[PDB]
Amino acid sequence: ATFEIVNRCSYTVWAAASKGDAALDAGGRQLNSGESWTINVEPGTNGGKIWARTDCYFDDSGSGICKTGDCGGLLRCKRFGRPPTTLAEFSLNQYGKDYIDISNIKGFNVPMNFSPTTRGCRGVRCAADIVGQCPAKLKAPGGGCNDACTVFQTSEYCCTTGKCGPTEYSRFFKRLCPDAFSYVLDKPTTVTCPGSSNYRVTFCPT
Ligand code: NA
Ligand code: NA
């Protein structure tokens, strides 16, 4: 499956693609403002994610740091990134279908649209100014808007026991972006797409 990753932001982002225990494609690349990077994701990929990293520095060998989304200091991500990270999430070829969503469960750093480029389903988007509007206690000094689990580490925010409800904090994310997950047990906003669809992830879509 192809994922075209497009940076419409006015600032550089470092795109990242991982399934948690491995890179997807090269795992990460710099995208200047306007640039597009197309990756290939193996069919059957379960639990894949794409995200943006901001304010990154890497040496010649691909080692460095990012202020949001850092994945172990690597340009080419092998693992998931450090919150806050708006997440494009997907599982491909799962009994004949693909499944996509955007999640704010790990916070928000960069607005994103995640849409198919092939027929048969809709895209999803979280493009509101969540950083500018972020509650004081959730603001990350490094940049971005943390989720409450990251800040406060309680069973209720982290849904540790699989029993949790919405919270003041999850409702903020849900209000700004109704079409993304705001906490672990949120009413799903997952889209079912035809098996082997292709996609475009656009940072700063509006
Ligand atoms: Na998923
Ligand atoms: Na999810």
Descriptors for this entry?
Thaumatin_CS; Thaumatin I; globular; 7-stranded antiparallel β-sheet; signal; mainly beta; monomer; cytoplasmic vesicle; Thaumatin; about 210 residues; 5-stranded mixed β-sheet
What structural class do the secondary elements suggest? mainly beta
Bound molecules: sodium ion
Q: Give the termini distance in whole angstroms.
A: 25 Å
Largest sheet: 7 strands, antiparallel
Report the radius of gyration as a whole number of Å. Answer: 16 Å
Q: Count structural domains.
A: 1
Please count the helical segments: 4
Helix percentage: 10-25%
Query: What is the N-to-C succession of helices and strands?
Result: EEEEEEEEEEHHHHEE
- Overall geometric form: globular
Fraction of residues in β-strands: 35-45%
- How many β strands by DSSP? 12
Topology:
Layout: E1 2-7, E2 13-18, E3 23-31, E4 36-40, E5 48-58, E6 64-68, E7 87-94, E8 97-103, E9 112-116, E10 124-126, H1 130-133, H2 148-152, H3 155-158, H4 168-176, E11 191-194, E12 199-203
Parallel strand pairs: 1-12
Antiparallel strand pairs: 1-4, 2-3, 2-5, 5-6, 5-7, 7-8, 8-11, 9-10, 9-12
Bound molecules: sodium ion (2 copies).
The site of one sodium ion has 4 residues, from β7.
PDB class: plant protein
Keywords: plant protein
Assembly: monomeric
Explain how this protein is built.
- Belongs to the thaumatin family.
- The protein is mainly beta and about 210 residues long.
- It is built from four helices and twelve strands, in the order ββββββββββααααββ.
- The protein has one domain (about 1-205).
- The protein has helices at about 130-135, 150, 155-160, 170-175; strands at about 1-5, 15-20, 25-30, 35-40, 50-60, 65-70, 85-95, 95-105, 110-115, 125, 190-195, 200-205.
- Strands 2, 3, 5, 6, 7, 8 and 11 form a seven-stranded antiparallel sheet that branches. The chain has a five-stranded mixed sheet with strand order 4-1-12-9-10, with no helix packed on it.
- A hairpin with a 4-residue loop joins strand 2 (about 15-20) and strand 3.
- The protein binds sodium ion (2 copies).
- The site of one sodium ion has 4 residues, from strand 7.
